[PDB]
C-alpha cells in the first residue's frame with residue numbers, strides 16, 4: 126500500500142529526476158516529510174496497473190495525454206488549486222489537464238520535438254525531408270549518417286505523419302470524435318511511406334531506438350536527431366557542437382509535432398493528498414523548484430508558471446521548440462489516447478521493418494482504434 130506521512134513520486138527516466146529529488150530534499154528540510162523520487166520503466170503503463178489495486182506513488186508525472194484515461198478509471202483525485210494559485214499559470218496549460226472541464230492534474234511545462242543538428246557536420250540543416258536522402262549519401266562517404274531518431278515510439282515519427290494530413294482524433298463541437306481518426310488517410314500514408322523509403326534506401330535503420338539514436342548523435346556519428354528539450358543536457362556533456370531548429374517540411378507542409386504538457390497528478394488512493402498538493406503548489410511550482418528541475422533536464426519550450434517563463438523564452442533552442450509547437454497540435458487527453466498510441470506504435474514499427482506494408486499497417490491501426 127501507500128503509507129501516509131511521506132511522498133513517493135514517479136517521473137519518467139528522461140526527465141530531471143535528480144533535480145526533482147533536490148526539490149524533494151528542500152521539502153523534507155521544511156516539513157520533515159520524506160520524498161522519494163523514482164523513475165520506473167514503462168511508467169505510463171505501470172501506474173494504472175498498480176494504482177488500480179490501490180498502490181503506486183503519491184504523485185505521477187507524465188505528458189497530459191495519458192491523464193484522461195487515468196481519470197476515467199478513477200485513478201486521480203480532482204486537484205484543489207484555489208483561484209490565486211491558478212492565476213500563476215497560463216490558462217491553456219490548465220486546459221490541457223481538464224478532463225470534462227475539471228482539473229485533474231497540475232501542468233508543469235510544454236514539450237515539442239525539434240530538429241537537433243551537429244553544426245560541425247551540417248552548419249546549414251535541411252529545410253525539407255525530401256533533401257535528406259541526398260544528404261545521407263554525401264555524409265555516408267565520410268562514415269557519418271544524416272539522421273537518427275527513435276523509431277520504436279510513434280511520438281517521434283508523428284510530426285512527419287501529420288505533416289501532409291495525418292491526425293489522431295478530429296475535434297468537432299468542442300469535443301473529439303472518437304470515430305473520426307486520421308491515421309490511415311492520404312497524408313498519414315504519405316508521411317509513413319517516406320519514412321519507410323528512408324529505411325528501404327538504407328538511410329535509416331528500423332531497429333533504431335531512443336538510446337541508439339542519442340548515442341550516435343552525442344558521439345558525432347550522425348548529423349541530426351529529433352528529440353525534445355530534456356535531451357539537451359546529455360548533448361551538453363558530449364563534445365558535440367549543436368543547434369536546435371525547425372523540423373523539415375514534408376511536401377511543402379510543416380512537420381506537425383504532437384505537443385505535450387508535462388503534468389503532475391495525485392493518486393486517488395493516496396493517504397497523503399495534502400502533502401502532495403503542498404509539494405506541487407508550494408515547492409515544485411515556484412521559480413526555485415522549476416529552476417532546480419530545469420537545471421538537471423530542460424523542462425520544455427515554455428513553462429506553465431508565468432513568473433518563470435518570462436526568463437525561459439530567452440534562447441534559440443526554446444524559440445525553436447515553441448515554433449515547432451505552434452506548427453503542431455496539442456495532444457488530446459481522451460481515454461482513447463492509449464489505444465491510439467498502441468495502434469500507431471505497432472503500425473510504424475511494422476511498416477519500418479517490412480512486416481506489413483504502410484497501407485496494411487495503417488489500415489489495421491485505424492480499424493483497431495475505431496472498432
Ligand SMILES: OC[C@H]1O[C@H](O[C@H]2[C@H](O)[C@@H](O)[C@@H](O)O[C@@H]2CO)[C@H](O)[C@@H](O)[C@@H]1O
Pocket residue numbers: 137139169188189190191236278279280281353385466
Ligand atoms: O510514442 C508514444 C508516446 O508519446 C508521448 O510520450 C513521449 C512524452 O510525451 C515525452 O515527454 C518523452 O518522454 O517521450 C515520450 C515518447 O517516448 C505520449 O506522451 C505517450 O503517452 C505516448 O505513449
